[PDB]
Amino acid sequence: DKVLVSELIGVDPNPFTQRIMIDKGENDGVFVGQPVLDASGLMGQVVEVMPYTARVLLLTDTTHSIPVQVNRNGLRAIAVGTGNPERLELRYVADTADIKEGDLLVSSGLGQRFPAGYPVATVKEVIHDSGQPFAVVRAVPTAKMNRSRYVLLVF
Ligand SMILES: [Cl-]
Ligand SMILES: [Cl-]
Ligand SMILES: [Cl-]
Ligand SMILES: [Cl-]
Ligand SMILES: [Mg+2]
C-alpha cells in the first residue's frame, strides 16, 4: 500500500550482473527482499541495505527468476533473467501452449515474493522445439530497468 519513491543512483558495472543502486536505505525502512518496480513493470528486489542507500537485483540477472502468467489466459511460467539488460526467457511453457508475440506477462505472486497482477514483460519470440516438451519464449521487460527515473519500493 505505502509506496516510497527512490532515485536510481548507480548501475553495477560488473558485466555479469544486472544490479542497480537506489537512494533509500535502512533509515527509510527499506529491507532485503523488498520488491522494486517502475510505472511500467516490476524491476526486481532489494538484496542489500545500507543506511541511506540499497542494492537491487533486476529481473534480467541470470540468477533471478519470477513466477509470471500470460495476462489474457492465465498460462503460468517462470521468467528467468538472461544477463541481457532487455531480455527474459520463459521456462515450463508447453511447446503447444497458447502464447504469442505481444502477449503481456504479469507477476503471478506464486513465489510469495512479488505482488500479483503487475506487468513484467511482453513476449518477443516463440520458437518451437521438435522432441522437447517446452517451447523457447523470449520476452522484453516493460520496466525501464537500468534506465528508470522513479524506482518505487512497495511496503
Ligand atoms: Cl533487511
Ligand atoms: Cl496478454
Ligand atoms: Cl538473451
Ligand atoms: Cl512471487
Ligand atoms: Mg552489471
Numbering used by the authors: 100 to 254
Sentences copied from the publication:
In order to allow unambiguous tracing of the MreCPa structure into the cryo-EM Coulomb potential map, we solved the high-resolution crystal structure of MreCPa(97-258) that harbors only the central β-sandwich core region. Fitting the refined crystallographic model of MreCPa(97-258) into the cryo-EM map confirmed that within each protofilament, monomers are ordered in a polar, head-to-tail fashion, with the β-sandwich folds contributing with complementing charged regions towards formation of the interface between two protofilaments.
MreC is a bitopic protein that harbors a large periplasmic domain, whose most noteworthy characteristic is a β−sandwich core reminiscent of ‘butterfly wings’.
